[model samples]
Target: SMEQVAMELRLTELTRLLRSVLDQLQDKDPARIFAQPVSLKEVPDYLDHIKHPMDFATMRKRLEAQGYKNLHEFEEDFDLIIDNCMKYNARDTVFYRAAVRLRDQGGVVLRQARREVDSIG
Candidate 1:
């Protein structure tokens, strides 16, 4: 038996669950800010403030490529996307407000998926 194959079996289920979570997040985000990478021209200091950038598109690419090894890896990127937005924008701004809403929604999504993942064993 291949150890890697065993690991990929877990990835298979996680990938499907994460894909759904990503889809839900995209649907909830009407502003479409998280749809793609942040624009440097628009947010010139984005890189300066946030070391790790994340977006729905990038996560989809990684998930399709099976780059994630476990649920936590996927969740980390998911949280990173929201955290970056909050860090970059002031609390009073629309962007920050949207990020807060996204953060709460993401928590719910991740929790539900987590139970499903736990049941996989």
Candidate 2:
């Protein structure tokens, strides 16, 4: 069975979710924690095949439809996904990396965007 396909699709969608949070991450301390390599990329690992709940299976559109229009909206969902990722010890996975990227580079890259009031959309 090609069971990997569903998770692959999930990983693809998570990347977009991670990208969206870039424009919204601002808190410093938590950002530092998330930016670190929580999952050891140096070692081989396996992520459990799992799917997060969404409006209609398309994660990004659902988030957009739900309106990630403020810090709370963005942070809340990131908090959920990030929590789930940690629970599964998925630091080596794409989801964890996206969390790291969103926290580290996401903040820095968007600072100018913030100053300029540039919408990430």
Candidate 3:
């Protein structure tokens, strides 16, 4: 239930944040900023081209397989993983934070899902 609860909370927060961003963007006149329409497909293509520093499921499994049952252990390994994967620059800090938040949330959801499934058996 906690996993469900956490996910619901996260979804709500993300939705609210996205709405706020959209509201801000709407206030700006697109015609003034650009002469041509930007391709939406470019956004997805750019994202796909970037390599993620860590694969949440893979990292979790590797840590668990190695007897690291604590979040801290995974976090440590994740930091190292990010450090190795990303270039050392201020812009990369934001990416690092986002990745860590995702990994943490993912781990919580995964553990909670496993518990719920096991209880059903």
| The best candidate in terms of TM-score | 1
Instruction: State residue 118's C-alpha deviation in candidate 3, in Å.
Output: 2.2
Q: What TM-score number comes out for model 1? A: 0.88
Cα lDDT tens digits for candidate 1, 3-115: 98987787887788878877987777889878899988987888889999999999999989978877889889988988898888899999889888888877787787889
* Overall lDDT per candidate, in order of appearance: 0.85, 0.46, 0.41
- At residue 81, give the lDDT of candidate 3: 42
For candidate 2, lDDT tens digit of each residue in 1-121?
Answer: 4678865555445445544544345343343444333343642342333244211123345454544444445445555545555555567876567555554644564455444333433
**Candidate 1: regions farther than 4 A off:** 1-6
* Model 2 RMSD in angstroms: 13.3
Per-model RMSD to reference: 1.7, 13.3, 14.5
TM-score of each: 0.88, 0.34, 0.28
For 27-118, candidate 3 gives per-residue lDDT tens digits of 33222221122233644553343344333344534533443433345445544444433443244575445444444544554465446434
User: Highest lDDT among the candidates is held by which one?
Assistant: 1
Q: State the weakest 10-residue window (summed lDDT) of model 2.
A: 49-58
lDDT of 1: 0.85
